[PDB]
Amino acid sequence: SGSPGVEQHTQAFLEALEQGGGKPLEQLSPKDARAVLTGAQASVKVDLSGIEVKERTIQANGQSIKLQVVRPANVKGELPVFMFFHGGGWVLGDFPTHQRLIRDLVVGSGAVAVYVDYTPSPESHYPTAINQAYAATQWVAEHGKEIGVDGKRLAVAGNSVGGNMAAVVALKAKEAGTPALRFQLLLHPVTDASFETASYKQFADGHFLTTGMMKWFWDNYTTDAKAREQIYASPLRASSEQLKGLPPALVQTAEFDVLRDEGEAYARKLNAAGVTVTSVRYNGMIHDYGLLNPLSQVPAVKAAMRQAGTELKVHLQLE
């Protein structure tokens, strides 16, 4: 269905989904909802070349955590590294659904991605996944040599709830005083457990990610209102003092996205706190433009991916 101004291929994609019909995602079991993303991502021929992928299980902060290490192919030596936190509304997502996005970031940056297999919701609730995400980030900083990376040159990155996770891991690293981070890449992040922004109102339906989906995602994550008010759930609620000293950020938002305004608002809060921020709204785009494989060849998406990889590279250089 979409709106005037939606990029042409994206609009055609939305119309194709509308014609395909199907139950609202939030009316499905977590298992069936996961299968929607799995099936849709698998339905598209995509370039996954130029990477080498290796699983690694680590012992960190009291639990076993599974990683996927994604390295630029045919490259020798220690490389700088970014943690990658996947989206999917906490309920959906995993490594293979996100592999093309991760691949594009790795190939475009020359840096190694460390995907963290955090526990999904509702199997776990806040703050289980963010504690895993932080534990893995500290692990990479300390033990990077074991997986062929320079852990002292370390960024965090993610899409959607993964952008939430990246932002929150940066906050947790500030709180803990470790590890040092070069950069945070937030691709259309969730930043606030509230649903009254102008973008939430304007794009409630018809633009892939719906308000109904967002409320369901948040409900599966946690129904504890006190938890939702914590900065580690809703980082937009942080004060300037709480944000001071965070690493430089690139925040990409999508024009036609309920989460657009809270993402841009978080960028403004970082800027007001003296954090270096580049905040770029990709016009014509819907939420998860960098994830969805049917959109991966849209020229604006390719440009967004080129930028994301380049900014990772710029911030992960030697000295």
Place this chain on the structure above:
Amino acid sequence: SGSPGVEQHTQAFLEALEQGGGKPLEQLSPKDARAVLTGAQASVKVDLSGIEVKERTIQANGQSIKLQVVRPANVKGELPVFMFFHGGGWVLGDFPTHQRLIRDLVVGSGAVAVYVDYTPSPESHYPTAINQAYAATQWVAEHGKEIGVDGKRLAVAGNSVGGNMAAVVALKAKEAGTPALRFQLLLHPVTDASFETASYKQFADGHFLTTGMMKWFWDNYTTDAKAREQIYASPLRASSEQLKGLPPALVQTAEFDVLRDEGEAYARKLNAAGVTVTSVRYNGMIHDYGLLNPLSQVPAVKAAMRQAGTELKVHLQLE
């Protein structure tokens, strides 16, 4: 003065200008206004390395036109090429005021820039400069070998009224059936001789480029209302049919810019006409963020420049 959300260094810049005082630009003679930009650009140490600059005067469509050819240094062979049309509101601007911006685009793309020294206003009026701009573009396509470029791989680029000029040259090339263009790079372009968009209302003052300046710029360009209604002055007025077949575009706009809305509106019109467009709003930025030397080290500006160079490069490749 600025607004909540203006990027921190940009805000400090605006405040410094406010404290410096001085007459409104539009109350100055063209000569004195030109000197404001010349002096301000010269007051900042900037990196101009990595280029070789050579002047060339050409005979094209009945007149002598001066070019500055800006080539990546230490590179052999034919290179692809982009025309560069400078901003300055038609009254101001020239090569040296714009040299750092041009340099960044050349170094970041690996392509040669051809700066066109169009006749300023009010010394000339519409359509003198755009006819010169087009003549030079056709010349480069035909005679590129003479200046070390592959004229068959040709883009147009410009900031502000230079973005207007690039967009209009692309339209003139469609009208003439020549030359073929790979790409149009529009950095915060002027697209419409009207002053009633929401951004014009919101950012009328306090954000460097004022509504008063824009009206003065347009008045110096042409006071002919019929001329202003032509698509070669106000390309936003073009129909979908008139825009069909134009080359792929990157349109960067600035959040805090009176011209923001008409730039984004032009991107939407291109998209509606089936033209490939990437439209990106750089949040926190003011107009001419890529031109103004005091802002050239602002991290978001560096990111915008990296993107602009990269997108030129991507679109100017072989085959």
